Amino acid sequence: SVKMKKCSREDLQTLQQLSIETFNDTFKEQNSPENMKAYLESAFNTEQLEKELSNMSSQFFFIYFDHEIAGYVKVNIDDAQSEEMGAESLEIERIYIKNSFQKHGLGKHLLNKAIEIALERNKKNIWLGVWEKNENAIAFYKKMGFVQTGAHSFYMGDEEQTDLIMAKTLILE
């Protein structure tokens, strides 16, 4: 069966390994091994993730299928967001499903959980940033109701790439 669990301090090691594997398998083709090694060490080292897990405005959730870890999602609100969007929004900063577990509705589960958290936190809108080249993720988000509201350049390695800003308005009552 499918189940999700909020990550705690004891999930640090598991979160770190899952983060590295899924991220590597997502940007591995368009980046040098040297740049990937450096980023993986600066983004997923024990101390960095420990800080993020302890951030009051951040929340991580694991998703499981048959008791096996299949992926995770990281959401931010207020000052924890990677962009200063305000106190009325929630960001899906990271969302990853292990390759072998993709195409089974698990990504949808994680995203809807992010939506549920946003609704519960009374946030007016939910948003995310996604590399323009990630066609699979863009198509998934559009199916989930997200729309591109903007786009800006960002540096990947030593070259600029395009980040698409996608969002959806929630409850306004």
UniProtKB/Swiss-Prot annotation:
Molecular function via GO: diamine N-acetyltransferase activity
Disulfide bridge map: none
Domain N-acetyltransferase intervals: 2-171
Catalyzed reactions per annotation: an alkane-alpha,omega-diamine + acetyl-CoA = an N-acetylalkane-alpha,omega-diamine + CoA + H(+)
Protein residues bound to acetyl-CoA: I95, Y96, I97, H104, G105, L106, G107, K108, N134, E135, N136, K143
Record has Amino-acid biosynthesis as a keyword: no
Phenotypic effect of disruption: Cells lacking this gene display release of repression of protease synthesis and sporulation in glucose-enriched medium.
Swiss-Prot/TrEMBL site (May have an important role in the acetylation of the polyamine) positions: Y141
Entry superkingdom: Bacteria
Example GO biological process: sporulation resulting in formation of a cellular spore
Assembly information from the UniProt record: Monomer.
Similarity-based family: Belongs to the acetyltransferase family.
Protein name: Spermidine/spermine N(1)-acetyltransferase
